[PDB]
């Protein structure tokens, strides 16, 4: 059986808190803030992605080139095997060739 | 796991609901009924 006999507890959904009330603010700092800053440096996140898009390969090559020297040996070893398996995969495997 | 079907219980029960009158292990188990329910239809 996968279903549950008794119901789960009713999760209270606070639609008015600090985050959701102030959500979406300061996204147009460039449009009507005399372009002193860009909305891309606003987001909090890793250093290998701050206002930039990439696939599995693109994000990995950007990672090892930027922060790979600081990464662990095991994580760096798995990263090299990942791009090597994905390099050949996108290049040789699939349709459209 | 992030996305899992929760109503698997019901979509098979409607199949077995039509196949209750079958004889043997068909009405009890699922895959036995799937072979016979479409054939009976």
């Amino acid at each position: 059986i996968g279903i549950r006999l008794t119901l789960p507890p009713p999760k209270v959904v606070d639609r008015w808190n600090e985050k959701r009330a102030m959500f979406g603010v300061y996204d147009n700092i460039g449009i009507l803030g005399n372009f002193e800053k860009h909305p891309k440096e606003l987001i909090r996140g890793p250093i290998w992605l701050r206002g930039w898009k990439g696939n599995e390969l693109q994000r990995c090559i950007r990672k090892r080139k930027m922060v790979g020297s600081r990464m662990f040996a095991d994580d760096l070893h798995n990263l090299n095997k990942r791009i090597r398996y994905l390099y050949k995969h996108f290049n040789r495997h699939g349709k459209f060739r | 796991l992030r996305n899992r079907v929760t109503d698997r219980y019901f979509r098979i029960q409607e199949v077995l609901k039509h196949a209750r009158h079958f004889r043997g292990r068909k009405n009890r188990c699922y895959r036995l009924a799937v072979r016979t329910v479409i054939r009976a239809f």
């Binding site: 549950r4 006999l5 119901l7 789960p8 | 796991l1 899992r4 929760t6 109503d7 219980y9 019901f10």
Partner: peptide, 26 residues
């Protein structure tokens, strides 16, 4: 437990339905 409560809701409707058929009130 797997996430979700919609399936558990309709199951309670199936439980009380069976409880109705088993021991219906007068």
């Amino acid at each position: 437990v797997k996430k979700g409560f919609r399936a558990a809701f309709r199951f309670q409707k199936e439980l009380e339905r069976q409880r109705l058929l088993r021991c219906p009130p007068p």
